[PDB]
Design a protein around this ligand. Structure first.
Ligand SMILES: *[B-](O)(O)CNC(=O)c1c(OC)cccc1OC
Ligand SMILES: *[B-](O)(O)CNC(=O)c1c(OC)cccc1OC
Ligand SMILES: [Cl-]
Ligand SMILES: [Cl-]
Ligand SMILES: [Cl-]
Ligand SMILES: [Cl-]
Ligand SMILES: [Cl-]
Ligand SMILES: [Cl-]
Ligand SMILES: [Cl-]
Ligand SMILES: [Cl-]
Ligand SMILES: [Cl-]
Ligand SMILES: [Cl-]
Ligand SMILES: [Cl-]
Ligand SMILES: [Cl-]
Ligand SMILES: [Cl-]
Ligand SMILES: [Cl-]
Ligand SMILES: [Cl-]
Ligand SMILES: [Cl-]
Ligand SMILES: [Cl-]
Ligand SMILES: [Cl-]
Ligand SMILES: [Cl-]
Ligand SMILES: [Cl-]
Ligand SMILES: [Cl-]
Ligand SMILES: [Cl-]
Ligand SMILES: [Cl-]
Ligand SMILES: [Cl-]
Ligand SMILES: [Cl-]
Ligand SMILES: [Cl-]
Ligand SMILES: [Cl-]
Ligand SMILES: [Cl-]
Ligand SMILES: [Cl-]
Ligand SMILES: [Cl-]
Ligand code: NA
Ligand code: NA
Lengths: 466, 466
């Protein structure tokens, strides 16, 4: 039979059933092929695969295996009741809205609970484990800003260009209906989720030959082509909620990745271990980088620019809203998919909404609807398991380097030549957090990530006038 | 004894007790003085006033009077439970935060319920009816924008200057730490609650000789000096919550004022009517103006720039959050007082928070704390009386005039004299709602409310940009 993590039987041999059943069958496939001495060469034959897949299914059926899952029964039940009771809050006037959520332990990668969809009876597609969609702007902290910080190419108060710029094909890089503004901090870039700063960040990574793919593959992401301008905005990427939750698990867990899983162990009746989850922790980002990103992602939620989440949760459960929440939102180019990823030090909860056929949601479906739904979901989870989110706080690792930098440039105050006239770059300052050894460079002319000659003249006009 | 609106006995002869008792005594005082044929001259004498004041008190105490209040018992009790249960949500790290609320019937001026403070036992000060504080930016819809619209000087998409400008004394007009930006619609001015636009608006009213005082006095505001630069920002105004609620009642009720009251009737034991509230409706703003303002204040709340209220309420009670809420926040110069005024077509709920000794609150006390508290208050009210808020919608009155104007100038497209070459003014347009006969004028060089020559060249720089 299939059990929760506490031995309680889920079933003998709905989303839960079919999902845990499917994972187990995959594990039984590997075991059975190995048992029967099937080489990888013969395992490539498609008729052989169908046989061993059918075999794996019957072994579970007419066999006496104990399948131990990571599922927390109380927490998963409560998530089902939340989507039953509160699912309808997602419906935004563009048809029935589908949903997928995964709740993951940050220290193990274990999946404690999930939401497969609005209602298994009406639609069986598994939106937590099977559906794959662009993660949109939630790509940014992982693939762009996170890597640039880790490479010591950027710190927390570094300045980026959000000046209008075009893709290679002459099209304006857009952010809803805006073609861009001017220079801005990483903080503002993340809080608003502007697109141009992420484009430049990724361009810079390519220019420095960074092994971006090495980072992503260490987190289990399969991206077929890295040579894409809109990659950091989610272009050319498609992920399940379970896999993408694993990325945010990595950032939340001070940069150490643990592979997601639902099955922890399968035993024969007599105790033989057919399968057991083996942990393989990987330091994907430096502790400095991850803890710096946590600080930035904390302000993403607290600024409330792209999500009402903290307001929604404050009202439902103000004590829970005082835990140390960080998170990032995502919106695809036509409002086809909305993401909201949330973490406390203990747990990450991933969330996607969208339509199965990929037509648009409303403009506010992620900002308001999904944020409100996920507040209910977070509150249901806590009510069922009152300690599970924890009261720990995210905190800068000691290894973090702090520089005093000029707010205007994001770099150390000093002299720079602005068209002939060697100039004293003065003015008010902030602490910038870096994940290298030396911190922030002295100010340069091209002080920002990205920007055209025209842009930099314009910016320096402003700066120079004070 | 004193009774609820339905005749149920409140008490025989704690905020509720002393409030209804004190109002009843003022009424008995008037009645007794006239009964005894005391002259207006004689009633100026201080010893005579005191005797009649004492007389009015004992008359109630000993007599067999029946005082009929407007108070709704279920609603008032539920408001007290909310402040008892949820008042702590106001505490923001600047010490114990005090509070006053008044719930008013928009069609009658009757007060259904109120919150005098956090806890009468601990602090007897009545923050609904007694204490007077600057209403800050909740002054703007009433005294500046409202009047300019009624006077046919402004419409809903009219443009205003938020360019830096100084008071007469040379100090910058501030908005938090901003000295201003550029031109902006009335909508954006209202959603953000910028200060400079209101300054210019009131200046314009002065220049036009508008009887501003006549309006405010018809709503029962007592402002001793109108010649004040910061009046439209709440400088030189101090008001009770009950009185200010009456101002928002006026806007909500399509421009028609009804005097606030808690006492509807006082009867001698034998049936003689000692006092009876007499309704005297007044059309303060035209129906056009008021319904245009309603539309603007709907977006103040829905934009969520200065209050999280709509998010807070959506999570508590999504069906109530779909009623037609409009409102305005306010914040005094040093964060000493926060206001949030809310209306549906049926009710108006005013709220203030602050400290008895007038020291600062936190930056977010109004934006988040008071908004969350008031969402709980509003929800408590609805639970106690499920239909009281109504599902009616605010709607433009038919007498409203609609003009197509340039998004850029807020005036009708046309040729203009731009410091040299006559220019054909083109570009995207919108509907602008006016309360006059002829709607928006054709574009003129000085198209916005306020702005220096310097400002106007700069603006026309961009507009002439296309
Ligand atoms: B990211 O997915 O948050 C970038 N977001 C957007 O580009 C975006 C959008 O694109 C069509 C539409 C509305 C809001 C957006 O981001 C706030
Ligand atoms: B009005 O009271 O809304 C004008 N508001 C402000 O000036 C204000 C402020 O001044 C101390 C500080 C923070 C936020 C404000 O309003 C948005
Ligand atoms: Cl399920
Ligand atoms: Cl499934
Ligand atoms: Cl369990
Ligand atoms: Cl997609
Ligand atoms: Cl394109
Ligand atoms: Cl790569
Ligand atoms: Cl993937
Ligand atoms: Cl590549
Ligand atoms: Cl698994
Ligand atoms: Cl490290
Ligand atoms: Cl917060
Ligand atoms: Cl919000
Ligand atoms: Cl669909
Ligand atoms: Cl330094
Ligand atoms: Cl270094
Ligand atoms: Cl350079
Ligand atoms: Cl760069
Ligand atoms: Cl009371
Ligand atoms: Cl009653
Ligand atoms: Cl006047
Ligand atoms: Cl007054
Ligand atoms: Cl005057
Ligand atoms: Cl009264
Ligand atoms: Cl009598
Ligand atoms: Cl009228
Ligand atoms: Cl809304
Ligand atoms: Cl005090
Ligand atoms: Cl017109
Ligand atoms: Cl007219
Ligand atoms: Cl000038
Ligand atoms: Na987003
Ligand atoms: Na305000």
């Amino acid at each position: 039979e299939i059990t929760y993590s506490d031995g309680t039987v889920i079933a003998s041999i709905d989303y839960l059933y079919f999902t845990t059943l499917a994972e187990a069958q995959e594990r039984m496939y590997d075991y059975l092929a190995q048992r029967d001495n099937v080489s990888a060469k013969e395992l490539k034959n498609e008729a052989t695969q169908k046989f061993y897949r059918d075999l794996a299914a019957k072994e579970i059926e007419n066999g006496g295996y104990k399948i131990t899952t990571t599922i927390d029964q109380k927490i998963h039940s409560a998530m089902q009741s939340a989507v039953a009771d509160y699912g309808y809050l997602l419906d935004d006037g563009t048809g029935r809205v589908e949903v997928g959520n995964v709740l993951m332990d940050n220290q193990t990668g274990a999946i404690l609970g999930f939401v497969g969809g609005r209602n298994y009876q009406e639609n069986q597609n598994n939106h937590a484990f099977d559906t794959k969609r662009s993660p949109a702007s939630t790509t940014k902290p992982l693939l762009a800003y996170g890597i640039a910080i880790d490479q010591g190419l950027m710190g927390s108060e570094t300045i980026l260009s959000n000046y209008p710029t075009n893709f290679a094909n002459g099209n304006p890089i857009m952010y809803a209906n805006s073609k861009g503004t001017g220079m801005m901090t990483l903080g503002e870039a993340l809080n608003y989720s502007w697109n141009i700063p992420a484009y430049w960040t990724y361009r810079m990574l390519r220019e420095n030959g960074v092994d971006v793919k090495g980072y992503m593959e260490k987190m289990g992401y399969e991206i077929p082509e890295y040579g894409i301008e809109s990659l950091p905005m989610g272009g050319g990427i498609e992920v399940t909620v379970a896999q993408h939750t694993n990325g945010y698990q990595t950032l939340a867990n001070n940069g150490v990745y643990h592979q997601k899983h639902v099955i922890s162990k399968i035993e024969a009746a007599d105790g033989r271990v057919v399968y057991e989850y083996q942990d393989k922790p990987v330091q994907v980002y430096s502790k400095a980088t991850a803890t710096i990103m946590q600080g930035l992602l904390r302000e993403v939620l607290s600024s409330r620019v792209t999500t009402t989440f903290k307001s929604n949760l404050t009202s439902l459960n103000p004590t829970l809203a005082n835990a140390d929440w960080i998170g990032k939102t995502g919106t695809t180019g036509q409002d086809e998919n909305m993401w909201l990823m949330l973490s406390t030090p203990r747990l990450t909860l991933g969330g996607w909404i969208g339509h199965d056929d990929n037509h648009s949601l409303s403009q506010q479906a992620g900002y308001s609807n999904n944020s409100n739904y996920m507040a209910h979901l977070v509150n249901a989870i806590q009510q069922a398991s009152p300690s599970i989110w924890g009261n720990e706080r995210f905190a800068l690792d000691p290894s973090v380097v702090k520089s005093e930098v000029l707010k205007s440039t994001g770099q150390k105050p000093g002299k720079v030549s602005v068209e002939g006239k060697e100039v004293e770059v003065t003015g008010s300052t902030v602490t910038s957090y870096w994940a290298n050894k030396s911190g922030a460079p002295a100010t340069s002319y091209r002080f920002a990530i990205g920007g055209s000659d025209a842009d930099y003249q314009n910016a320096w006009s402003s700066i120079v006038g004070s």
